[PDB]
Amino acid sequence: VFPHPQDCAQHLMNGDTLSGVYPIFLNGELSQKLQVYCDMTTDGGGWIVFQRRQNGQTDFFRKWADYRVGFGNVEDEFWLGLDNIHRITSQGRYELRVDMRDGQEAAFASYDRFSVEDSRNLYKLRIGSYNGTAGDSLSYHQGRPFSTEDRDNDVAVTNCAMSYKGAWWYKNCHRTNLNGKYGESRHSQGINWYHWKGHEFSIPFVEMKMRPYNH
Ligand SMILES: [Ca+2]
Protein backbone atom coordinates (compact mmCIF):
# COMPACT_ATOMS: atom_id res chain seq x y z
CA VAL A 1 0.00 0.00 0.00
CA PHE A 2 2.81 2.37 0.99
CA PRO A 3 5.98 1.64 -1.02
CA HIS A 4 8.09 3.86 1.27
CA PRO A 5 6.42 4.03 4.69
CA GLN A 6 6.94 7.33 6.50
CA ASP A 7 5.92 5.93 9.89
CA CYS A 8 5.13 2.74 11.76
CA ALA A 9 1.40 3.00 11.06
CA GLN A 10 2.09 2.77 7.31
CA HIS A 11 4.28 -0.28 7.95
CA LEU A 12 1.38 -1.75 9.92
CA MET A 13 -0.94 -0.96 7.03
CA ASN A 14 1.35 -2.88 4.65
CA GLY A 15 0.91 -6.01 6.80
CA ASP A 16 3.95 -5.81 9.07
CA THR A 17 2.76 -6.78 12.55
CA LEU A 18 5.95 -7.56 14.53
CA SER A 19 7.44 -4.94 16.82
CA GLY A 20 11.09 -4.19 16.13
CA VAL A 21 13.41 -2.08 14.03
CA TYR A 22 12.09 -0.70 10.73
CA PRO A 23 13.35 1.86 8.23
CA ILE A 24 10.94 4.74 7.72
CA PHE A 25 11.23 7.19 4.83
CA LEU A 26 10.46 10.76 5.80
CA ASN A 27 7.79 12.26 3.54
CA GLY A 28 7.81 8.95 1.70
CA GLU A 29 11.19 9.82 0.16
CA LEU A 30 13.57 6.94 -0.49
CA SER A 31 16.51 9.27 0.21
CA GLN A 32 15.21 10.16 3.69
CA LYS A 33 15.66 6.85 5.44
CA LEU A 34 15.69 6.73 9.23
CA GLN A 35 15.93 3.61 11.38
CA VAL A 36 13.31 3.53 14.14
CA TYR A 37 11.72 1.13 16.61
CA CYS A 38 8.07 0.35 15.84
CA ASP A 39 5.67 -0.65 18.64
CA MET A 40 3.13 -2.75 16.70
CA THR A 41 1.10 -4.00 19.68
CA THR A 42 0.19 -1.14 22.04
CA ASP A 43 -3.41 0.05 21.51
CA GLY A 44 -3.47 -1.45 18.02
CA GLY A 45 0.17 -0.70 17.12
CA GLY A 46 1.73 1.64 14.62
CA TRP A 47 3.85 3.73 17.00
CA ILE A 48 7.30 5.22 16.41
CA VAL A 49 9.14 4.89 19.72
CA PHE A 50 11.45 7.90 20.10
CA GLN A 51 12.62 7.53 23.69
CA ARG A 52 13.08 4.56 26.00
CA ARG A 53 14.41 4.05 29.52
CA GLN A 54 14.65 0.54 30.96
CA ASN A 55 17.95 -0.23 32.76
CA GLY A 56 20.08 2.86 33.34
CA GLN A 57 23.01 1.60 31.30
CA THR A 58 22.88 4.58 28.88
CA ASP A 59 23.88 8.07 30.01
CA PHE A 60 21.16 10.65 29.37
CA PHE A 61 22.93 13.65 30.95
CA ARG A 62 24.09 14.91 27.58
CA LYS A 63 24.36 18.23 25.79
CA TRP A 64 22.33 20.10 23.20
CA ALA A 65 24.19 18.66 20.23
CA ASP A 66 23.54 15.12 21.48
CA TYR A 67 19.82 15.76 21.99
CA ARG A 68 19.70 17.39 18.53
CA VAL A 69 21.15 14.38 16.64
CA GLY A 70 20.01 11.48 18.87
CA PHE A 71 21.88 8.83 20.80
CA GLY A 72 21.54 5.27 21.98
CA ASN A 73 20.38 2.02 20.40
CA VAL A 74 16.74 2.04 19.27
CA GLU A 75 16.39 -1.54 20.61
CA ASP A 76 17.63 -0.51 24.09
CA GLU A 77 17.73 2.94 25.76
CA PHE A 78 17.77 5.87 23.39
CA TRP A 79 16.67 9.33 22.26
CA LEU A 80 15.70 9.53 18.61
CA GLY A 81 16.94 13.14 18.26
CA LEU A 82 15.14 16.46 18.20
CA ASP A 83 15.75 17.16 14.50
CA ASN A 84 14.28 13.73 13.66
CA ILE A 85 11.29 14.25 15.94
CA HIS A 86 10.66 17.66 14.41
CA ARG A 87 10.76 16.22 10.90
CA ILE A 88 8.45 13.31 11.73
CA THR A 89 5.92 15.49 13.57
CA SER A 90 5.92 17.98 10.65
CA GLN A 91 4.72 15.42 8.12
CA GLY A 92 1.21 15.23 9.63
CA ARG A 93 -0.73 15.39 12.88
CA TYR A 94 0.65 12.94 15.43
CA GLU A 95 -0.57 11.77 18.80
CA LEU A 96 1.86 11.13 21.66
CA ARG A 97 1.67 8.17 24.01
CA VAL A 98 3.82 7.72 27.09
CA ASP A 99 3.87 4.14 28.49
CA MET A 100 5.31 3.68 32.00
CA ARG A 101 5.77 0.62 34.21
CA ASP A 102 6.78 -0.18 37.82
CA GLY A 103 7.08 -3.91 38.29
CA GLN A 104 3.68 -5.35 37.36
CA GLU A 105 2.02 -1.91 37.53
CA ALA A 106 1.51 0.08 34.37
CA ALA A 107 0.02 3.37 33.23
CA PHE A 108 -0.14 5.60 30.18
CA ALA A 109 -0.75 9.17 29.05
CA SER A 110 -1.91 10.05 25.54
CA TYR A 111 -2.16 13.46 23.83
CA ASP A 112 -4.14 14.00 20.62
CA ARG A 113 -1.54 16.37 19.14
CA PHE A 114 2.25 16.23 19.39
CA SER A 115 4.92 18.28 17.69
CA VAL A 116 8.27 19.95 18.33
CA GLU A 117 9.29 23.09 16.40
CA ASP A 118 12.63 23.46 14.57
CA SER A 119 16.17 24.22 15.86
CA ARG A 120 15.65 27.96 15.45
CA ASN A 121 12.51 27.80 17.58
CA LEU A 122 14.28 25.73 20.29
CA TYR A 123 12.21 22.61 19.60
CA LYS A 124 9.21 24.08 21.48
CA LEU A 125 6.70 21.46 22.59
CA ARG A 126 3.08 21.41 21.41
CA ILE A 127 0.69 18.82 22.85
CA GLY A 128 -3.03 18.27 22.49
CA SER A 129 -5.76 17.03 24.82
CA TYR A 130 -5.02 14.33 27.37
CA ASN A 131 -6.51 10.95 28.14
CA GLY A 132 -5.17 8.03 30.11
CA THR A 133 -4.38 6.44 33.45
CA ALA A 134 -1.06 8.06 34.42
CA GLY A 135 -2.40 11.55 34.98
CA ASP A 136 -1.62 14.63 32.91
CA SER A 137 1.89 15.67 33.89
CA LEU A 138 2.94 16.93 30.46
CA SER A 139 0.49 19.83 29.96
CA TYR A 140 2.55 21.79 32.47
CA HIS A 141 5.23 21.83 29.74
CA GLN A 142 2.93 23.18 26.97
CA GLY A 143 4.71 25.52 24.62
CA ARG A 144 8.10 25.39 26.33
CA PRO A 145 11.47 25.28 24.54
CA PHE A 146 13.83 22.37 25.07
CA SER A 147 16.74 22.85 27.48
CA THR A 148 19.92 20.91 28.20
CA GLU A 149 22.52 21.38 30.91
CA ASP A 150 24.67 23.42 28.46
CA ARG A 151 21.78 25.39 26.96
CA ASP A 152 19.38 26.89 29.55
CA ASN A 153 16.13 28.04 27.92
CA ASP A 154 13.91 27.60 30.98
CA VAL A 155 12.22 30.30 33.08
CA ALA A 156 13.79 29.33 36.38
CA VAL A 157 16.55 31.38 37.93
CA THR A 158 18.43 28.09 38.21
CA ASN A 159 19.46 25.71 35.41
CA CYS A 160 16.66 23.13 35.51
CA ALA A 161 18.47 20.54 33.38
CA MET A 162 21.53 20.68 35.65
CA SER A 163 19.52 20.73 38.89
CA TYR A 164 17.28 17.84 37.87
CA LYS A 165 19.86 15.76 36.01
CA GLY A 166 18.10 15.77 32.69
CA ALA A 167 17.09 17.38 29.43
CA TRP A 168 13.54 18.52 28.81
CA TRP A 169 11.03 21.24 27.93
CA TYR A 170 11.57 22.70 31.37
CA LYS A 171 9.58 25.61 32.81
CA ASN A 172 10.23 26.07 36.55
CA CYS A 173 10.99 23.23 36.50
CA HIS A 174 8.89 20.17 35.73
CA ARG A 175 6.12 17.70 36.39
CA THR A 176 7.80 15.04 34.27
CA ASN A 177 11.50 14.44 33.72
CA LEU A 178 11.75 11.36 31.52
CA ASN A 179 15.37 12.03 30.43
CA GLY A 180 16.40 12.31 34.09
CA LYS A 181 18.76 10.22 36.17
CA TYR A 182 17.88 6.51 36.15
CA GLY A 183 17.06 5.11 39.60
CA GLU A 184 17.40 8.51 41.31
CA SER A 185 14.91 9.00 44.16
CA ARG A 186 16.13 12.46 45.23
CA HIS A 187 13.26 14.89 44.67
CA SER A 188 12.74 15.78 41.02
CA GLN A 189 16.11 14.39 39.83
CA GLY A 190 14.90 11.00 38.56
CA ILE A 191 12.60 9.66 35.84
CA ASN A 192 9.48 11.27 37.24
CA TRP A 193 5.88 11.36 36.04
CA TYR A 194 4.43 13.40 38.88
CA HIS A 195 0.78 12.49 38.64
CA TRP A 196 1.55 8.76 38.63
CA LYS A 197 4.39 8.29 41.15
CA GLY A 198 5.40 11.75 42.42
CA HIS A 199 8.80 13.38 42.46
CA GLU A 200 10.61 10.92 44.78
CA PHE A 201 10.18 7.83 42.60
CA SER A 202 12.20 7.14 39.48
CA ILE A 203 10.17 5.07 37.02
CA PRO A 204 12.17 2.02 35.84
CA PHE A 205 10.61 1.68 32.36
CA VAL A 206 9.25 4.42 30.13
CA GLU A 207 8.65 4.69 26.37
CA MET A 208 7.62 7.86 24.47
CA LYS A 209 5.98 7.11 21.12
CA MET A 210 3.90 8.71 18.30
CA ARG A 211 1.40 7.64 15.67
CA PRO A 212 -0.68 9.61 13.14
CA TYR A 213 -3.81 11.08 14.71
CA ASN A 214 -6.98 8.94 14.63
CA HIS A 215 -5.08 5.96 13.19
CA1 LIG B 1 17.25 29.06 33.94
Residue numbers in the entry: 1131 to 1345
The paper states:
PNNs are a condensed form of neural extracellular matrix that include the glycosaminoglycan hyaluronan and extracellular matrix proteins such as aggrecan and tenascin-R (TNR). TNC and TNR share a common domain organization that includes an N-terminal cysteine-rich region responsible for the formation of disulfide-linked multimers, followed by 5-14 epidermal growth factor (EGF)-like domains, 8 to 9 FN repeats, and a C-terminal fibrinogen (Fg)-like domain. Here, we demonstrate that TNR and TNC associate with the single fibronectin type III (FN) domain found in RPTPζ and provide a structural basis of these interactions. Overall, our findings provide novel structural insights in the interactions between RPTPζ and tenascin family members, prove that the formation of a RPTPζ–TNR complex is essential to the assembly of PNNs, and provide a blueprint to explore a potential role for a RPTPζ–TNC complex in neural function.
